[PDB]
């Protein structure tokens, strides 16, 4: 995809497997004031091998892993269960908090990396350990040309192999950094036709175009080439244009400058549910009842505006949708949020089939387990769930 490092660097490497995104001490050299961390990114595809887009983002800090698999919430806990929008692990003041269109976290250090539910990734240091950075972010020293070196520390002349060099240790079948075979590069003729108004139009720099004030704070020049490249290589549907524009809009808005409306004139408007008050600029950290409801407020909640369908008007925002003020708004159990009684699994032992009474400020649980030839190991991006012990195969042979 399109990258922007902790250093002042942007690049468009494409990948197929987990790569080291961020982190501080790959070799562990700086053994002073040591609080090491590491985060990794993974790229998947949806039909066209020309490019790849973020699928699952993984981090590992202070004996605790985190992962998001491009959906509404969760997959972050070490036990394997998915986590809600606000949640407190209670160990080391760690708490994941997700904005209406964002998903950040915090710890005793205050590390905050925000990934959208669909291919929009951003990391931010807690200013805890800032000295050296290990991962795709690079050294992150003032210079931007020295970021690319191998995890072994050697000079890296081949940046296409950089991701594989920093890829997750192990064997990754069918993970090619570049398209080994013939690659269906988009023709040059359609780029002039598609770049006009109505398709990557507002993204283009223009005083008449909306959010012209947003141009000074954040340069969209990187966004401009990306829009054309990922719509021409794509079939040309309008959703790609909306997702391309929204990224630059949110970036320049969080830079601090307000934005005037562009969704209506461009034809792409979100059909958000319930209250769904779409606002050009509205407060971040929407009103959500904290699972502790008494712990300290995240430091990121005091921040600039973000474009998203705020639901806080009337009903509050909880469990990724709008819930009325009398709604459950989470179960509030040991700093953990249980949303609308989704009948979750508390622990990996499969015993705790806990339905959540979120308005009751407590949970009603059952001790049953899967069994029945399906043991309760962790499912891929799911609660502790059943998985068959063994499945044979009947071959109905034919001549």
């Amino acid at each position: 995809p399109h990258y922007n490092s902790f250093d002042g660097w942007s690049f468009d490497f494409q990948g197929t497997c987990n790569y080291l995104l961020a982190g501080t001490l790959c070799p562990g050299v700086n053994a002073e004031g040591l609080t090491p961390f590491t985060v990794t990114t993974k790229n998947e595809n949806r039909g066209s091998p020309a490019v790849s887009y973020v699928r699952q983002v993984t981090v590992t800090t202070l004996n605790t892993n985190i992962s998001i698999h491009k959906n509404e919430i969760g997959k972050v806990r070490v036990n394997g269960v998915l986590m809600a929008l606000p949640v407190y692990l209670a160990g080391g003041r760690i708490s994941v908090i997700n904005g209406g269109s964002k998903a950040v976290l915090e710890t005793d250090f205050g590390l905050q990396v925000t990934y959208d539910w669909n291919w929009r990734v951003d990391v931010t240091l807690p200013s805890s350990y800032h000295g050296a950075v290990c991962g795709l972010c690079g050294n992150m020293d003032k210079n931007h040309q020295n970021d690319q070196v191998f995890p072994n520390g050697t000079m890296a002349p081949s940046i296409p192999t950089w991701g594989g060099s920093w890829q997750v240790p192990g064997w990754d079948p069918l993970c090619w950094h570049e398209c080994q075979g013939s690659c269906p590069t988009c023709p040059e003729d359609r780029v002039e036709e598609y770049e006009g108004p109505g398709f990557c139009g507002p993204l283009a720099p223009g005083t008449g175009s909306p959010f012209t004030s947003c141009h000074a704070h954040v340069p969209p020049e990187s966004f401009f080439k990306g829009c054309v490249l990922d719509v021409c290589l794509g079939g040309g549907s309008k959703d790609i244009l909306c997702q391309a524009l929204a990224a630059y809009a949110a970036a320049c808005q969080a830079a601090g400058i307000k934005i005037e409306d562009w969704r209506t004139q461009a034809g792409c408007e979100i059909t958000c549910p319930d209250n769904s008050h779409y606002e050009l600029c509205g407060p971040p950290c929407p009103a959500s009842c904290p699972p502790p409801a008494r712990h300290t407020a995240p430091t990121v909640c005091d921040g600039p505006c973000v474009e998203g369908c705020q639901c806080d008007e009337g009903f509050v925002l909880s469990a990724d949708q709008c819930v009325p003020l009398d709604g459950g708004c989470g179960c509030w159990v040991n700093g953990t949020y249980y949303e609308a009684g989704t009948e979750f699994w508390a622990d990996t032992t499969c015993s705790k089939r806990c339905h959540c009474g979120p308005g009751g400020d407590s949970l009603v649980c059952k001790p049953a387990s899967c069994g029945l030839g399906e043991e309760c190991a962790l499912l891929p991006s799911g609660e502790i769930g059943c998985q068959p012990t063994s499945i044979t195969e009947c071959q109905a042979w034919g001549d």
Binding site: H2, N4, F6, D7, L21, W119, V121, D122, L125, C137
Partner: peptide, 13 residues
Amino acid sequence: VPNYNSTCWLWGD
């Protein structure tokens, strides 16, 4: 130096 709180952004596609 307390003034280089920095960010890393990964943009989809």
